[PDB]
Amino acid sequence: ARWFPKTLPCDVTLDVKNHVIVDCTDKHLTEIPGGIPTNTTNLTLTINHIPDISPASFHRLVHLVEIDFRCNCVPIRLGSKSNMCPRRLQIKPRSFSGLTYLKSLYLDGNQLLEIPQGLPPSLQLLSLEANNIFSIRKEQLTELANIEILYLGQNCYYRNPCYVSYSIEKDAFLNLTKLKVLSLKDNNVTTVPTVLPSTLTELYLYNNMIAEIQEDDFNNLNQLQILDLSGNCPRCYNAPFPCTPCKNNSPLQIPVNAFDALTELKVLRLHSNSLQHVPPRWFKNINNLQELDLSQNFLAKEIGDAKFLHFLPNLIQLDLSFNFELQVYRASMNLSQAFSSLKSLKILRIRGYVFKELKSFQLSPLHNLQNLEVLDLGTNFIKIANLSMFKQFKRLKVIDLSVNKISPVLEQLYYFRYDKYARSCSCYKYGQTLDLSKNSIFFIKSSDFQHLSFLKCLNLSGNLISQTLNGSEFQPLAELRYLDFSNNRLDLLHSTAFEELRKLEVLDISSNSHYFQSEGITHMLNFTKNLKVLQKLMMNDNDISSSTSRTMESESLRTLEFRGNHLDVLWRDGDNRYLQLFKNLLKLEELDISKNSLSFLPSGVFDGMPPNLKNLSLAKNGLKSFIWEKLRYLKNLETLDLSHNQLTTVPERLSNCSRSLKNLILKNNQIRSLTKYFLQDAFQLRYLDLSSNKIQMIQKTSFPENVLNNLKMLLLHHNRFLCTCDAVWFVWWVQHTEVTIPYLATDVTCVGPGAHKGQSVISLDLYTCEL
Amino acid sequence: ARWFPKTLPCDVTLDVKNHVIVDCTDKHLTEIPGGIPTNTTNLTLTINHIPDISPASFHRLVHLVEIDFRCNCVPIRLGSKSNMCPRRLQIKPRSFSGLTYLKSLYLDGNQLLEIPQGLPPSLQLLSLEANNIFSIRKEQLTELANIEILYLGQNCYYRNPCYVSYSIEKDAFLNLTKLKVLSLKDNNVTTVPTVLPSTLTELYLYNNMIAEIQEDDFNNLNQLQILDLSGNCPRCYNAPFPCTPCKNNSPLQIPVNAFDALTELKVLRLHSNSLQHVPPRWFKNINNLQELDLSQNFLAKEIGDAKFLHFLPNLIQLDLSFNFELQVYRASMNLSQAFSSLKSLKILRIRGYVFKELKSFQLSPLHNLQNLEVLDLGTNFIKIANLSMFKQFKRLKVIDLSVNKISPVLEQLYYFRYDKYARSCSCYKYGQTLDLSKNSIFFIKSSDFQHLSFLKCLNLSGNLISQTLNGSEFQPLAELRYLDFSNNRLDLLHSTAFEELRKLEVLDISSNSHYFQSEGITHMLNFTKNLKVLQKLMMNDNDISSSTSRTMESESLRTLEFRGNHLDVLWRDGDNRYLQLFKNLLKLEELDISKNSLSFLPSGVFDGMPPNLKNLSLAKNGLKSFIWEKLRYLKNLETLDLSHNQLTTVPERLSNCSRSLKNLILKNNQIRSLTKYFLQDAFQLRYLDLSSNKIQMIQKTSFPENVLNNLKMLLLHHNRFLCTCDAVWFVWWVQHTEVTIPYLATDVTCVGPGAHKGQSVISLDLYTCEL
Ligand SMILES: *[C@@H]1O[C@H](CO)[C@@H](O[C@@H]2O[C@H](CO)[C@@H](O)[C@H](O)[C@H]2NC(C)=O)[C@H](O)[C@H]1NC(C)=O
Ligand SMILES: CCCCOc1nc(N)c2[nH]c(=O)n(Cc3ccccc3)c2n1
Ligand SMILES: CCCCOc1nc(N)c2[nH]c(=O)n(Cc3ccccc3)c2n1
Ligand SMILES: *[C@@H]1O[C@H](CO)[C@@H](O)[C@H](O)[C@H]1NC(C)=O
Ligand SMILES: *[C@@H]1O[C@H](CO)[C@@H](O)[C@H](O)[C@H]1NC(C)=O
Ligand SMILES: *[C@@H]1O[C@H](CO)[C@@H](O)[C@H](O)[C@H]1NC(C)=O
Ligand SMILES: *[C@@H]1O[C@H](CO)[C@@H](O)[C@H](O)[C@H]1NC(C)=O
Ligand SMILES: *[C@@H]1O[C@H](CO)[C@@H](O)[C@H](O)[C@H]1NC(C)=O
Ligand SMILES: *[C@@H]1O[C@H](CO)[C@@H](O)[C@H](O)[C@H]1NC(C)=O
Ligand SMILES: *[C@@H]1O[C@H](CO)[C@@H](O)[C@H](O)[C@H]1NC(C)=O
Ligand SMILES: *[C@@H]1O[C@H](CO)[C@@H](O)[C@H](O)[C@H]1NC(C)=O
Ligand SMILES: *[C@@H]1O[C@H](CO)[C@@H](O)[C@H](O)[C@H]1NC(C)=O
Ligand SMILES: *[C@@H]1O[C@H](CO)[C@@H](O)[C@H](O)[C@H]1NC(C)=O
Ligand SMILES: *[C@@H]1O[C@H](CO)[C@@H](O)[C@H](O)[C@H]1NC(C)=O
């Protein structure tokens, strides 16, 4: 199709509007490549090893609005140790001054010593994170008259130290009269720099050495919407980063009138400031405040009083997590009545308060919060909770009691990680959720869930339930749609397990391997028959190698995840009792039987598949052979994943195996060559992955053009391609085709002959084959 | 050193006595190789694809006493499906008759139709398992006059069916006057063949279709020691193989006088015979009986009566496992007083009796069994057990309550597998063991172990213990040497955990990842300080990524398994706080920190290692780089396992890194070449593994002969060796060296230059490099 092969090692995209995008992210480049389109508006060269920039770099590219040149020399401790950057990035005079339309420049992570000068006046965003610029002078900032967004953080901290205090000249930023966003985080800053331009909307001063706020420090910032002063005087108990507290167990000292000017303030973040009190006076003139983070302080006592809450009626989120007093295990949670002032509250989080017994009345300040959607009391070591108290919280979307010690989405490192916003180079949607995951529930019965019939999802993942569920345990949960019972010890003695959950759409019993791992125990896998609206069943990593029932049954079920089991043993050659195990799942469209140690499939496995099977995975089975003809049985098969196996051959003619098949994944196999007519007339095919095999040669007969050209994608990388004159057609095709083939720049490569070893096939001149 | 290179693709061993052993096991052979030593006494060709035997096969090898020719054509269902055997093995006339000294012939698993004829009269052992010989005639057996051991089983069963009954001519075996061992198992046999020669010591008739024993069937077998009639009229409940019971739930019918002749019988096996009664009269004339297997019958009631036990005073092992009545959960275990008759009993196993409550008095028949060493009551769904009852079983070596449901070594498939003796082509030694693994113990306290101070090992692996152990939980266990606490949920709030176990030598707290997987929880890894005689600590797969203590401490500890954790995060670059985590384990000699996601090691890791470290593993870390010089810090290092990483290079001179190092494992890395003087003067070295890398070339400078020749082993297989004239020395060396290098037959191989692709380097003629 194409007249001129795209030889540029960067993805090029159009958009009309009106952007020409050139993305060279992570292309192992040591120079800016030649032939970048002159119309280029956005050029990305992130993660490469380009050691300098000069006026030659961008000469012809006068229409550039954005250059993203991040991480071409990242600080030693932040980057790869196998390929360390030898020397900081060199920027030569007048490299940017030509770029009359340049609006964004990202130079993060280049070990720069200074704010690059000679930048053009059209620049709105400038990002210099993770460099070694730790002294800002007014003179260096004059070029930035029209600047709106300025990221200067991570220039002096434990991952990238500068060994002195940050320095900011008096009034350095003042004459930047258009500045809206300033970030000075992770910098060893000692005082709020002043005076700052009043135009500011967002100010980020977190993770620094600021011991005191002066009452002056935010006087003029009357358009400020986000202030973050977190991690100045951090609370260091169990901190997963090196943590130095302020002397004398002191807090970040904030004058009572410090926030008076900030009438527009929407978000205030005071996490890890070692605060013992929260003075009401702080919020006297802020009534627009919507988000407040008071996590990681010493506010356990203040939670019982909290007079400041009366001043916060528009507040949408409040976080008081990890305010526990060291070495104290409270009997209960004392929430102040003041919590009842929070008319607009949607999200309340009080993780890590740390108390033994939760009781209904203790949440009564929350009863009339009409908008409350989330109550998060995770990680509290709660031992006792009458779950029925939550009958008064029907309106809530999520009740999170995750990670507690009861017996009858945020980052996994969120509250403790250093900078949760650091730049690198789920059943809630079913309705009301009670999350009881990672608790100590060993026994359940009906009354445990009394008054909880409104519940739509229940998370019991990671408890100790080790019990012969007979259909009586969950009887009140008449509206339950999703049950996560993963990481328990389900005993399937009774096929009546779970049948009381008459509205159940999704059941996860993955990682309940305990009772499947011992010989001679009963397992009623036919339990699915009773669940009339069950759509999705996950029974992964259960080590299932024996079953009392010969057949699983459902009129409703569509997806079955059966990965990480032992069908190899169930379908032991010579034993045909279980070949029809899935056949009576009549509406089953998706089946995952990857990770089942299936070296081979006995005859009968395919015949025994249910008739509407569409998406089949046999990945990661160590499969050494595959009778491809047997795909004829699966009359609606559209996706076949045979990734990560040991197949050495493809079918002689794929269209004689399956007429329906559209997506064939054969990556990470041992295929050495294709059959002479492999894809001939396979008109249904649309996605083919042959990456990470050991193919040398592809001839036209195997890959007819009329099939190839309707492929949405065709993955060929990491093979063993021989670039002799026999390869003439393949090479030509690859160079001139519109079909998307990833990694041409990077890992579609000749291994031989001699001359062309290691050379990418996109770049290959084979003119000597026509001389 | 050697004058003539060993080119035969088989391991050759001498022994004086006086055997020349040639082992060609699994060498992908399609012919018997040439040049087998004429003095060969034992030739093994197991698992190859040799399609026939003829007089040429063994012509010169007249001194052969044993031919093992197993599995060169295994039945379709038993063998590989990627390389199925096309056609049964052909044996030609007179292939064996020359072999005048032949004493053993194994022809198992070759799809033979008939007992190969023309065998020599010196033959003592003949094995024809897993063939298709399912009709034995007196005439075919006349060659075997002097035969002593005859294995004919697995010729007709579900893994290798023959579709008819087995047939044995009347008196077929009678004139084999020297026969001692006859095995007719897994054969669809319908009656005990008669008359059998009285010389028999062992008779194997298990897994067949024998409905009745005639009172005659064992009349003359007065030297018989082992009889096994198991799995005739099997009990089929939860059988993991296809299982057809005798009609009317009938048992194997055994006349009361059937065993009268068997005065020498030592072992009787009646497993899976659907027995409802055990008539005393059976044992009237057998007082030598030492082993009795009555597992998989319907003997629940009989266990309460068991009059037959009075006739068995010399019995050493008894097995009554899996005799439960279907659908019954007994309240208790009724053991007959008759159990007190068993003066010689060492081992009693009553798995799968199935009862709720175990109580002291119920074991009183066992109190005066002076020799009892093992009581196995595993897999009983016991809910309640005062563990103090075992104060009356101090003399026992093992009390096994594994796989039960309690709250406040044999095969994993042993009792249920088809043929536990099918041929394929641990803290007990510390003293008294109480195995409580895989139970439902969620809470422990002191009194749980009252009167149990004699215990030396306790297995609590795989319970639900989820508790802040403070040093009070195990207080009675004053002599305990080994605690397996693996697969629980240890909460290390307190550093006093386990301190009451003052004699503890080994602690396994592996797979207690639950509390290490959540953020902001305390973990006192310094808990080891209190354990004064602790030798070995296993804390594998705990996902440990944070720690309250900066240092682990012990004066005693020698081995620490810390595999499968997140030292990568603990030793996050820039964070120095945990670089000395193991330093104060002063006597630590072995450390495993494989599987820790260590892409690189920060500086300080090696400095912070304790001073007597000898065996260090960094396997399976994805390590991309390694400063080898830093090995100088580990002054007593002897074993370094860097297997399964991404190292691309070896040290310039290994002796400049470590003077102590003896075993260096670099297998499964990405090493493309060795340094010019790699092993120069490394006189301490003894074992070097460079297998599975991508090395092309090794020159003499890298591998000096004076280092090489003290190596006990040197692994080079699965590399990318180029066999040009530059390789002349390497090839010569490999052909003529006495140093052990495994897999020279199989996987030490040229990939090029072209001619020699796929040719083994042992066989390589490079004379053209000297022309
Ligand atoms: C933050 O600034 C302080 C100075 O305020 C740095 O601390 C100095 O570091 C050197 C070498 O580490 C010491 O010898 C000085 O005495 C330190 N001075 C003080 C006052 O502590 C600190 O390292 C800087 N932080 C970072 C991460 O670069
Ligand atoms: C040794 C197997 C006994 C019969 O099978 C079997 N399988 C299980 N999963 C349970 N759970 C379980 O509690 N039992 C005990 C039982 C036995 C009979 C009647 C009721 C309860 C189990 N028995
Ligand atoms: C979430 C912050 C609580 C402090 O750390 C922490 N870590 C643990 N592993 C436990 N186990 C545990 O039971 N607690 C609660 C506790 C707290 C103080 C005193 C006694 C008991 C824990 N607290
Ligand atoms: C192109 O640059 C403009 C200005 O920086 C930006 O708003 C737009 O999102 C960019 N598009 C990219 C990187 O694809
Ligand atoms: C249940 O909680 C677990 C463990 O905290 C989490 O992995 C999982 O996402 C939750 N399941 C659902 C369906 O939300
Ligand atoms: C289920 O078990 C509960 C108690 O464990 C019992 O009340 C109920 O009757 C049982 N149901 C059936 C159908 O056996
Ligand atoms: C399930 O398993 C078997 C039949 O295969 C039978 O014992 C049991 O009653 C069946 N129950 C249900 C609900 O299908
Ligand atoms: C060699 O064969 C003899 C006779 O069958 C046997 O007893 C001996 O175990 C064999 N030895 C080895 C090492 O294979
Ligand atoms: C055992 O014999 C019966 C008839 O006697 C036959 O139908 C059956 O197939 C045989 N079994 C096998 C496994 O060959
Ligand atoms: C268990 O039995 C012992 C006798 O050895 C007795 O001292 C103890 O009180 C019993 N404990 C319980 C909890 O039943
Ligand atoms: C404890 O029991 C488990 C089986 O439940 C086993 O794998 C482990 O090796 C046993 N521990 C010891 C120390 O023997
Ligand atoms: C362990 O570490 C803590 C400090 O992190 C200390 O309080 C405690 O006493 C130490 N315990 C032992 C047994 O060393
Ligand atoms: C080193 O450790 C491994 C197990 O971790 C062991 O198999 C090996 O024998 C040890 N080496 C020596 C020389 O003791
Ligand atoms: C390494 O070699 C150099 C030069 O031979 C020597 O000076 C140095 O001390 C050596 N280091 C060790 C650890 O042997």
Author numbering:
A (entry chain B), B (entry chain A): 27 to 42, 44 to 435, 459 to 475, 490 to 835
Publication excerpt:
TLR7 recognizes pathogenic single-stranded RNAs (ssRNAs) and plays a crucial role in the innate immune response to viral infections, such as human immunodeficiency virus 1 and influenza virus. The activated TLR7 dimer contains two distinct ligand-binding sites. Small-molecule agonists, including imiquimod, guanosine and 2’,3’-cGMP bind to site 1 in the dimerization interface and directly induce the formation of the activated TLR7 dimer, while uridine-containing ssRNAs bind to site 2 and allosterically enhance the binding affinity of site 1 ligands for TLR73,4. Using cryo-electron microscopy (cryo-EM) combined with X-ray crystallography, we reveal that the structural equilibrium between open and closed conformations that underlies TLR7 antagonism.
